[PDB]
Structure formats: structure tokens, C-alpha cells
């Protein structure tokens, strides 16, 4: 936004030319100013007021605060801004305070939601959008997170990895997520491999994990706790007893005992 004489104007100009840390310092004083205004929380007393120093101003300020938060690598704060910002566009319906950076925040928000590994939240967000059909398909930006979410489920790790590396969005602020997402996939791929192969070459595992330096692959094989013999990794699919609990599993002994108690349930149901 052009310079006039607010904090709001200066913050938008700063973010564009860099200055991300400076912007994060500015964000609590910027908040303070907003507190004075009653227009910070969105109202349902509007007739349809979408002017600057109504909804529209308040929207623009939150967005810039969301973007600053990403850049600083402060995903929780992004969510805070997003929770605040999100009604302004629409809850179910509102058309008159729409933008194209909207598309990019919600997609950044889906992905942020993905790396954390919650299917239910993901789906829940898609539903929240103004329509099921219109929004999910129409937006280029939205397409990246749905497609990545489908293939992660599917087993098509390589297509999804490849799509993030080559991506347009990778330059921007999918950049932030790329490091988290890479570790998550590579972990899944190492477990598939652990199960499937009795033995496999070291060269093969370095390429599947999406390394091409020998040394890193030795560190990861060790982290995973695999023996390696020369030229080959050997795999042990290596169970232990337990992984939390839930009886029918033995606090103190006997499934036969669980049968005796459940026998009292059906043998009381006879006698009388």
C-alpha cells in the first residue's frame, strides 16, 4: 500500500522490500493501535460496509502480519493471524472483500496443516471454503496442497517430492514447508523399504531417500539403526514389545482371564 502516515502503510512497504525481523518487532505496536479501533474483530452489525477503516483495512493489515510470520518461520503466529483474518473473506458467504493473496494464504494454511499429519483438520478446512467444487478446482494455489495430500496417501511419494522441488511456489513460501515435508516423506519411504527388502544396495537407498551424497546415507541408516555390510543395507523390520497400552494386552496375565470375566457376564445371564 502507498505511504500515507500509518504503521500499516509502512509495514506493507517494508515486507515487500525484505525487513522481516523489523516487521515482527513492528507487529505488537501495530496490534496496539488496532486495539483502539473496535474494527479489529469482525462485526455482524454491518449492512455491507467494506470500506477502508472498515473491514477492508483490517484485512489488509492481518495479511501482512501472516506473511511476516511465515518469513520469520513462526507458524503458530501465522495461525493466530489466520484465525482472525478468515471470517473477513467469508464464513460461508460474503463476496465483497475478496483478493488473490487469499488463495496463497489458505493454500499455505493447508500445507502447514499437512506437515503436522492430521487428516481430519485438512478435510475440515476444505469444507469451510465457500463451495466444495468451485474453490478446490478453480484455484491453482489450492491445487498444490490437495494433490500432495492425495499422493501422500496413495504411495506416490516420488511424484509429490518432485512436484514440490520443481514448483513456482517453492520459490515463495512453500520454501518454508519443503524441509519439514522432505523429512516426513523420507521417513515413510525408509519404513516401506525396511519391510519390503531383506537386502538392498546402499546406492539404491541414497537415491530413494532423495540424497546423492554417500555420507548422509550412512548417517541416516545409523539413525534408523540398520546394520550395513559393505555395498548393502540389511533390514530387520525391528519390533519391540508394547507401544502405549489398552488391556486385552496384559497389565497382569491372561486373555483366558478376560474370557472368565466375560463368562461371568454370560453365565449370570443364564441362572435366573
Amino acid at each position: 500500500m502507498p505511504s500515507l502516515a500509518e504503521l500499516t502503510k509502512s509495514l506493507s512497504i517494508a515486507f515487500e522490500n525484505g525487513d522481516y525481523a523489523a516487521c515482527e518487532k513492528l507487529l505488537p505496536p501495530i496490534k496496539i493501535e488496532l486495539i483502539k479501533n473496535n474494527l479489529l474483530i469482525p462485526d455482524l452489525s454491518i449492512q455491507n460496509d467494506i470500506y477502508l477503516n472498515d473491514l477492508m483495512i483490517t484485512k489488509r493489515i492481518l495479511e501482512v502480519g501472516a506473511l511476516a510470520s511465515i518469513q520469520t518461520f513462526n507458524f503458530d503466529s501465522f495461525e493466530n493471524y489466520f484465525n482472525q483474518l478468515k471470517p473477513y473473506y467469508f464464513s460461508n458467504n460474503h463476496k465483497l472483500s475478496e483478493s488473490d493473496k487469499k488463495s496463497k494464504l489458505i493454500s499455505l494454511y493447508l500445507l502447514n496443516l499437512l506437515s503436522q499429519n492430521n487428516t481430519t483438520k485438512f478435510h475440515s478446512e476444505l469444507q469451510y471454503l465457500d463451495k466444495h467444487i468451485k474453490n478446490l478446482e478453480d484455484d491453482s494455489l489450492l491445487s498444490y496442497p490437495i494433490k500432495l495430500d492425495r499422493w501422500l496417501m496413495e504411495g506416490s511419494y516420488q511424484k509429490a517430492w518432485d512436484l514440490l522441488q520443481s514448483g513456482s511456489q517453492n520459490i515463495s513460501e512453500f520454501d518454508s514447508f519443503t524441509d519439514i515435508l522432505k523429512s516426513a516423506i523420507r521417513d515413510e519411504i525408509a519404513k516401506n523399504t525396511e519391510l519390503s527388502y531383506d537386502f538392498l544396495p546402499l546406492s539404491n537407498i541414497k537415491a530413494l531417500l532423495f540424497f546423492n551424497n554417500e555420507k548422509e546415507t550412512e548417517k541416516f541408516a545409523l539413525e534408523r539403526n540398520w546394520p550395513i555390510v559393505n555395498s548393502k543395507v540389511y533390514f530387520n523390520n525391528q519390533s519391540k514389545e508394547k507401544a502405549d497400552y489398552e488391556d486385552e494386552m496384559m497389565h497382569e496375565e491372561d486373555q483366558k482371564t478376560n474370557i472368565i470375566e466375560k463368562a461371568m457376564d454370560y453365565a449370570i445371564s443364564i441362572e435366573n
Binding site: 474483530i41 469482525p42 495461525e79 484465525n83 478468515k86 471470517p87
Partner: protein
């Protein structure tokens, strides 16, 4: 139907930021409660501070939520601590219900306490708040 703008602000710090949300949330707890229940640990966190003395106003919102869940012993306690915002002459669905439970709790306590003592209501053995 979202409490999310208001609920988001509790997770940020500065007393001003906490104040701005609290009072918005207070009016519409009864209405907005489903969403507000998930932010409950945080609302308890406001309460447990005593450098930030709008503890009593946290407490009052939290009580409403505790009622709806069905932890009545817990709600009653927070309702006491709220003090000058627990007024029994207002007589809403909120106020009436926790008042009922309050008399209930004194009565229970007063059985056990009569058998032990014959002066307990004049003393600090039981809660002055309950007594008042």
C-alpha cells in the same frame, strides 16, 4: 459461527491483548461454547496468574464452559473466584444453575461438618465464599 478471532488472541501476550478478547468472549460464551471448550487449558492459564488480575473475568467465562461439560464441582469453584461478576440477582440460565449447585455443595459439606463441630459456619474451616 466462530469464536476463532477472539480465541486466537489468548494465545498472544500483552495484558491489553488479553483484555480486548475477554470482554467480547464474556457476552457470548453460552452462545459460542463448542469452539470455546477446546481453548479451555489456555483460559485456565489466565486464571492461575495473579499478576494479571483480570483472573476473575477468565474464571467467569471458564465456569460457563465447565457447566456445559458437566463438571459442576469445578464450575462452582471458578464461579466463587469470579467474585464481583458473580451476581445471583441477575437470574439467567447461567446464574440460576450454578447457584443451585452451590447450595447443594454447602449442604453436603454441612452434614459432615455438623457431626465434627457446632460452630463451623462462623469459622474458616469451610469456604467464606460459600458462606457469603
Amino acid at each position: 459461527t466462530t469464536a476463532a478471532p477472539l480465541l486466537a488472541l489468548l494465545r498472544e501476550n500483552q495484558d491489553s491483548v488479553k483484555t480486548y478478547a475477554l470482554e467480547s468472549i464474556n457476552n457470548v460464551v453460552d452462545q459460542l461454547w463448542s469452539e470455546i471448550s477446546n481453548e479451555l487449558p489456555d483460559i485456565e492459564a489466565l486464571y492461575d496468574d495473579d499478576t494479571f488480575s483480570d483472573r476473575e473475568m477468565a474464571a467467569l467465562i471458564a465456569s460457563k464452559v465447565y457447566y456445559n461439560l458437566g463438571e459442576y464441582e469445578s464450575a462452582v469453584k471458578y464461579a466463587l473466584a469470579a467474585k464481583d461478576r458473580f451476581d445471583i440477582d441477575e437470574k439467567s440460565q447461567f446464574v440460576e444453575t450454578i447457584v443451585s449447585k452451590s447450595i447443594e455443595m454447602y449442604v453436603q459439606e454441612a452434614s459432615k461438618q455438623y457431626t465434627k463441630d457446632e460452630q463451623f459456619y462462623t469459622k474458616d474451616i469451610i469456604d467464606p465464599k460459600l458462606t457469603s
